[PDB]
Write a protein that binds this ligand. Sequence first.
Ligand code: SF4
Ligand code: SF4
Lengths: 149, 71
Amino acid sequence: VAKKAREGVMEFLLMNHPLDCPICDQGGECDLQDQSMAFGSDRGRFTEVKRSVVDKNLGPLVKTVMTRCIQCTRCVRFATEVAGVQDLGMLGRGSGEEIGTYVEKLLTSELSGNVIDICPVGALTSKPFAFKARNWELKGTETIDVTDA
Amino acid sequence: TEAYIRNKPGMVSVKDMPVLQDGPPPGGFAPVRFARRIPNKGPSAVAIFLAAFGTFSWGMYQVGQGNKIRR
Ligand code: SF4
Ligand code: SF4
């Protein structure tokens, strides 16, 4: 029962997902990717035209290709609980449901990098780290911070 | 993701859809040969021995006649 539930749900997501992994960074880090590879099926049965939306700008920190906004509301819940400023919001209906400030404003708050870490699928991504590297290429050293206190 | 890619044109069900054209023609091309076969058809024993001995005797007779002439 649980196995088939997961298989079907992953089937629906990857059905109406875009198909641009080899340019979409977070490819190699993506939850949706690893979750599909480990728990979902292996073949898709779908031919018809998908849905696509226009990308969005949120200042020079978090660029978004909203073609892949899978309607999780992680960013919305973060921006309304931890950040403090209520700008992001989920608007629309049905398959035609986007996430974006309605008056093309920016996001004048900190923790927006935390937004780009929260958002699992690679849509909200750091602009100054646009396409410089995948994750499997670089090594991580665990340090502390000196800018803040 | 397979139906029309494999074959779109006119099938009613997923079976009898494709045309493959991969392997051999009907018949196995031949029965082939694998066993060695080296025919032995040369003059076996007595032919070659008589040839050698007879040509030797006759060559000696010719040497005799020639040495007679030369003397
Ligand atoms: S975020 Fe989605 S589209 Fe991008 S690499 Fe992952 S699976 Fe591919
Ligand atoms: S994970 Fe990111 S791109 Fe996907 S629905 Fe949530 S906010 Fe949108």
